[PDB]
Amino acid sequence: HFLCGVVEGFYGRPWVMEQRKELFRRLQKWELNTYLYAPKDDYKHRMFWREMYSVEEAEQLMTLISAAREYEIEFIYAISPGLDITFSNPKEVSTLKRKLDQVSQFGCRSFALLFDNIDHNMCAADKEVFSSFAHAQVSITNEIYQYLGEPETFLFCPTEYCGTFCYPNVSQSPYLRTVGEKLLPGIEVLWTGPKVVSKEIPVESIEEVSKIIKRAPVIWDNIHANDYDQKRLFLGPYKGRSTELIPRLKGVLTNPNCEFEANYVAIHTLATWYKSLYSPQMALKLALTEWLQEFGVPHQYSSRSVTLEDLQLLADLFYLPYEHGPKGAQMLREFQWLRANSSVVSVNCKGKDSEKIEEWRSRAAKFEEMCGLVMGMFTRLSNCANRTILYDMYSYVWDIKSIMSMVKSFVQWLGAFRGGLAGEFQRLLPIDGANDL
Amino acid sequence: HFLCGVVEGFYGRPWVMEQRKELFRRLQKWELNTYLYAPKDDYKHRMFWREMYSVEEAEQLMTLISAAREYEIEFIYAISPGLDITFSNPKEVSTLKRKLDQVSQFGCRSFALLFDNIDHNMCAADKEVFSSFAHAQVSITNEIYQYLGEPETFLFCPTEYCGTFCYPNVSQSPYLRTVGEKLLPGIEVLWTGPKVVSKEIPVESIEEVSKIIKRAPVIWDNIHANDYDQKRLFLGPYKGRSTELIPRLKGVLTNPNCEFEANYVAIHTLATWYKYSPQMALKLALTEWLQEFGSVTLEDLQLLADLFYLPYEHGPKGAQMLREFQWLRANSSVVEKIEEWRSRAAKFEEMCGLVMGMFTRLSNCANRTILYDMYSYVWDIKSIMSMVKSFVQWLGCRSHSSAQFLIGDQEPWAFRGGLAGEFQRLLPI
């Protein structure tokens, strides 16, 4: 069957077990079926992948893997040994087997080997044994498949895991030719689309890759991932992927925002898209409408609120990687126009103009009200009762509100170390606002 | 005696109780004595301050207040009712008293009333009873002082809490004149310096404020606060405050970084200063911190601290990379005695390598709690230096190539900041 769900596949602080249980609740609520465990910086997933879990760690994994079963979500355990492993040393191979067995005894029946972002060339001993980097990965992936008894679901993420990472192209890649041929027919292949973060995943691109790897891939979708930029959050709907892909694919797993509570939209809309033909804008409405209920006012026994419009504003400000939501783009166009047409100056060298200065002013007030809606959105969100949500999003909301606050001032006015060192180096690169509207 | 320690006084995710216990450990380890609880976004501290703590909330505060006593750290409970309180309605006043009693029964004997970020506002009904905003605040602050039995430590943070917030200046403020006169002698006054985030706290500025409020203030120090800027972290030493201030002050509480594990340097160096050379204090603190990791070297931490140093200053290795990159960009047009450009480019490209190395070893460390609290910030700097290294490379490879810097369709991280970033670029800052 078709895999649809979430991969916890991002860099940084991983999610905690209470959060993952709440995740399984939601995947079931929305009729998704899969979870792939692959947090890049849970140390025993990648950095110290040889190390067996301690007894108190094992108690938490088995408790987690059983919540997965309790909630009818399939649990796929991933391991990323590609960094420093010697493929031909059988102690390494045995260590990998030992590690998998251990998790299997916690009651896990599905697995994955990830070879994402790693040096293309092996050590000396390995070049001796294997003809290519591809051959080495397959050989151990197959061996491990078989050693585990050819389990229900088994995933392999290649080093050339998207269009732009294929040397020299997708169709003629010796690496992918080798995966297609030698990887055992029951092992599945993860693929992120044309790019690492794909704006669109066109059907023809999936036909093209499927030909060379001899099967339908499972999409690891980075569309809502935000690990690569401190300032970014993605609350927009699943988008750029035709429902026509579903027959051509073995699954879709989203790698979403690091901040757990910020993924309501990202996952609800994936679900909506799975069950459909699909309208991003309508899926967002469904998802925002449902999300609103999760934001209380606090209970009060002594005394002397977030709306749907607030959430719509918030999502349009923190939307998708290649697109702002309509209320965000509107405030942007309007502010550009105001700055451009600020010839309502006292030091005026066009005498004046009645009509053109009435328009500027009129549009400034209208804009100053839009800025108010941002401040209002922040105020009511900080007054909400679900603090877990407030905290997961606080810095992002504060930021936008403070900057809009300063933009409002600046427009009014028309009538320094910020970002820190990183900010200062950034301003000096001349591609700083190179994708701005 | 004299109050020195930490205020948990910032906006955002507050610290958790395990973190606060570990904090009390450290304050004692380093001979600090105080903690002020005032996280802006515990809902019952400020927004819904009338509300009593629930049973499960009360169980956690009692458990926390007793760890404070266990570790010989004084615990001061703050409350920020300034937003919507009616000062003249005695139900409001009673509600405030009810709330304080509740915390006292959790075993807490020290308190504070905060009136920080509030608009010089009275509702009517209040303007009827009280002649000014200042009069109204003191009247309830005094009443509450007395009602609690005039406790050991009691703090009052004024609305005019720093130089730039005093109308029209510090010396002639009717607001502060009124606080100085009518606030009872055993209540203390919190003050953040000339600014909200003070670069320096000069002695004369403290003499000046002490005169008008008729006592020595307790400094709420925002020097290492990072709640106001997503991209900023402060690992530099306590600085800009003369050791001559210590006799002129009733205390110093730092309001430090939101990310708990990032405050080792910020608090160790405060302690060192409480007994001064900033660069020697940093060395003491970085040397001690290195042990808590585990492979990460001292040179790695020195680089990291210099990259994320202080609000008005970068550390020497950071400022150096900056001046050198400015020079390279400025003098690129010559790509006769410009073997110096090339030479300086390679030398710079090696500096960028040390950043990548620092990040690599930090992600391989065994103290994951620390890694996570700082991960975003370290990734960011590494990615940006990585792109700076490229750009310098590209500048050099230009006598043999006329390719664009960005070649074709990019991944989103090439273009930083999102919508916030785009509005920022449109301001002149």
Numbering used by the authors:
A (entry chain A): 59 to 334, 373 to 400, 552 to 662, 680 to 701
B (entry chain B): 59 to 333, 374 to 392, 552 to 592, 602 to 695
Task: Please give the exact wording used by the authors of the publication that reports this structure.
A structural overlay of OGAcryst-D175N in the substrate-free and substrate-bound states illustrated that substrate binding did not induce any changes in the dimeric structure of OGA.
OGA is the unique enzyme responsible for O-GlcNAc hydrolysis from a large number of cytoplasmic and nuclear proteins. Recently, our group and others have independently identified crystallizable constructs of OGA that comprise the catalytic domain and stalk domain, and published the apo form structures and enzyme complexes with active site inhibitors. These reports consistently showed that OGA formed an unusual arm-in-arm homodimer, where the catalytic domain of one monomer covered by the stalk domain of the sister monomer to create a potential substrate-binding cleft. Exploiting our previously reported construct of OGAcryst (residues 60–704 with the unstructured insert residues 401–552 replaced by a glycine–serine (GS) linker), we solved the structures of a mutant OGAcryst-D175N (catalytically impaired but retaining the ability to bind substrate) in apo form and in complex with each of four synthetic glycopeptides.
